[PDB]
Amino acid sequence: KEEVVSREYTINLHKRLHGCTFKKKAPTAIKEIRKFAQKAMGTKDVRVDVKLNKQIWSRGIRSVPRRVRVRIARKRNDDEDAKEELYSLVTVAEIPAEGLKGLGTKIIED
């Protein structure tokens, strides 16, 4: 519909990382988030903000958060002969006072 769009998602990392090896759990979370953005935005080029990477690794390589609230912003790449026209940037999102209860997908305005 619109190439430039931003939304907030709650990714259930617990079920995606179920039964994963400890030494690859947090690294696998990065891959799962990258795959999640591709399906939700249809852009192969996905960039993970360093703050989100810090949150994923906050509790070490084993204990990844069960659920994470993230903002995915699809935007146009303006570099000479970019491999892809668009790319997705995944960053951390604020959690309301009530937490992740009753919180669905939300579209962020301009």
Partner RNA sequence: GUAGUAGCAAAUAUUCAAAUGAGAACUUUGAAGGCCGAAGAGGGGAAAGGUUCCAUGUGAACGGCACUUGCACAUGGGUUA
Partner RNA sequence: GUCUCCAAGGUGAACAGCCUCUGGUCGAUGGAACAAUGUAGGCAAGGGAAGUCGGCAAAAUGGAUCCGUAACUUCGGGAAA
Partner RNA sequence: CGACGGAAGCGUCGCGGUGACCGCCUUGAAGUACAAUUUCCAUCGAGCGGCGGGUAGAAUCCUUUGCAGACGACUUAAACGCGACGGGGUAUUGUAAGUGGCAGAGUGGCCGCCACGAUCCACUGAGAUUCAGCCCUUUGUCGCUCCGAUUCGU
Q: Is 105 in the site for RNA (CB under 7 A)?
A: yes
In order, the DSSP letters of 74-92 are EEE--STT-SSSEEEEEEE
Contacts of RNA in 41-100 (CB under 7 A):
42, 46-50, 53-54, 56-58, 60-61, 66-67, 99-100
Handedness of CA 92, 99, 67, 43 (dihedral sign): negative
- Cα 48 vs. chain centroid, distance in angstroms? 7
CB of 33 to RNA, least distance (A): 9
> SS3 of 14, please?
helix
Residues in the site for RNA, rule: CB under 7 A?
A: 1, 7, 9-12, 14-16, 18-19, 21, 23-24, 26-28, 30-31, 39-40, 42, 46-50, 53-54, 56-58, 60-61, 66-67, 99-107
